Amino acid sequence: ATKAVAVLKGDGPVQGIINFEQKESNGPVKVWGSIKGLTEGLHGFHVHEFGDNTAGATSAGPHFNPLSRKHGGPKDEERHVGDLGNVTADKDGVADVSIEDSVISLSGDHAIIGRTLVVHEKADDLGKGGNEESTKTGNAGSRLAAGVIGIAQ
Amino acid sequence: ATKAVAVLKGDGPVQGIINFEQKESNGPVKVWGSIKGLTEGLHGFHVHEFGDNTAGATSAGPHFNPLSRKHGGPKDEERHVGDLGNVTADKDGVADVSIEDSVISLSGDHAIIGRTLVVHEKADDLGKGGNEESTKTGNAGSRLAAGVIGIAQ
Question: Where does Cu cation bind (chains A, B)?
């Protein structure tokens, strides 16, 4: 029933399109698409609380974390709602995404419609990097590309 | 209060930032901001049903019309939910937007959050254009700039 999409865009080579689908409001959200222009390896993949309020915004903005948990991996009970972990780019810089998440939703309090999907500069350390910043952002670094999550055809 | 924001982006010089605010969930939505890079005169200003599912999309898709009405002006009872009429650009090509609307909402089943705000090539004829396309789109023409309506800080 509920379907959504984010077009990932930035001031750079990184671009992609990520689809969200959730057949029942109690069910998982299937997340699939691909991102190109990435450096080989892992890149943080997070939902941030707000849409851009400026042209050519560089900041990622706060993580989507309505329950005020510490940053973790998507498998962890202790995590932000928006903690979707890492996408993996191949040697050509293409990252094909195919995950399922039961913490994000496309409806209700934890709805990510109207929020921002961001692929990050560096790998998300999943809260296990051993410093204060690890429990906030996973040390994923800067926003390479982002898109507001919108309703999809 | 519910707040939203759309960053209107295009290929040409047309760009803008439009804010939405709704003090009461059954009250009017305040729409304000500014658009620049426009030709002097009236430009169609509509909420469309879907967010882009492609990079560099040139088409504004279907109008957001969940109640299946005919196209009209914002003051008409016969209108789409997304029929916000026209904005007016001065001789410097800048349109100061200051609207209030009681058909659109930022919440509920027919919330515009996650939909696309689009500024169009030419004036909306408000359904009074004298052909079939008039009662569908108001003949406002191509999309000049667009943005997904996201949640605002």
Answer: 46, 48, 63, 120
